[PDB]
Design a protein around this ligand. Sequence first.
Ligand SMILES: Cc1cn([C@H]2C[C@H](OP(=O)(O)O)[C@@H](COP(=O)(O)O)O2)c(=O)[nH]c1=O
Ligand SMILES: [Ca+2]
Length: 129
Amino acid sequence: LHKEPATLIKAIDGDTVKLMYKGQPMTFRKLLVDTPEFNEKYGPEASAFTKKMVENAKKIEVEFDKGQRTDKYGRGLAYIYADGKMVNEAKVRQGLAKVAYVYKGNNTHEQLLRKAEAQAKKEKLNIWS
Ligand SMILES: Cc1cn([C@H]2C[C@H](OP(=O)(O)O)[C@@H](COP(=O)(O)O)O2)c(=O)[nH]c1=O
Ligand SMILES: [Ca+2]
């Protein structure tokens, strides 16, 4: 797996972000995560966490997995990195997202994310409190 450049067009919500990748605007859905909606418990803070992290980054990167690169809704499927730090992981590590949607073709960072989730759960953070 390799990181590739992109730029932020717009933070959308906890699980999606609009980026420019190879010069074309694209909505990306973050691999391996599910974030509570804004109306749900921790929703507001979960999106704000995600929004900040992408908006404050000076360098955004995208890393596709080995399986399909776009979902059935035309969304790009990747791990998103902000100044070298994986957004997908970081959300889970804060207890502001859950590991979810782990499909066979695109699961490279599963155990990494599950560890982050086990840490947040051990600390009883946020959705685990
Ligand atoms: C994260 C991810 C979601 N999806 C699809 C499954 C879900 O389909 P359904 O719409 O049929 O439930 C939907 C969840 O995305 P959201 O959590 O953004 O809604 O996106 C994939 O197909 N591949 C993936 O890797
Ligand atoms: Ca979602």
